[PDB]
Copies of this chain bind each other. A is one copy, B any other.
Amino acid sequence: TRRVDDATVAIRCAINNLIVELIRGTGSYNRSSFESSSGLVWTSGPAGEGSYSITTPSQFVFLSSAWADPIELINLCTNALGNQFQTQQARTVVQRQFSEVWKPSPQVTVRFPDSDFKVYRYNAVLDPLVTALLGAFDTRN
């Protein structure tokens, strides 16, 4: 019963399926597209401080720890495929890397970054892929 030669295939199909989208960029936001599709509007209270105005509670997701640097992330995918996922420590470490990569960039009192882009953990298209991936690491032996 080598279940961990099926899991190795599942983990790899999962990393590839994610890469296909990261390459096209899909799920990457800048100050403009973030505020446009989230609906959060920045009001420029003085002096150098400000804040977003929450109109519905659904927007609290956008302000959670859901953002990753598009380069740092795509690099995890590059190095991930160069691992022995027959072993446990591999599956346990890289999985943690695909869980902690998402940190928070936008806050109620911290406007979305000026020029950089970010990748949205809960983006409609990436969400299922980053899920399946994190879940394919979850095998026993």
Determine which of B56, B75, B110, B135 lies in contact with A25 in the assembled complex, contact meaning CB atoms within 8 Å: B56
How many A residues, CB 8 Å from partner?
A: 69
B contact residues around A111 at 8 Å (CB):
48-49
In the bound assembly, the distance between CA atoms of A132 and B74 in angstroms comes to 18
With contacts A56-B25, A57-B25, A60-B71 taken as known, whether A135 is within 8 angstroms of B49 at the C-beta atoms is: no
Is A129 interfacial (CB-CB < 8 Å)? no
A binding-site residues for B, Cβ under 8 Å: 2-5, 8, 12, 16, 19, 22-25, 28, 30, 42-51, 54, 56-61, 63-66, 70-71, 74-75, 78-79, 81-86, 91-92, 95-96, 98-100, 102, 109-111, 114, 117, 121-122, 131, 134-135, 137-140
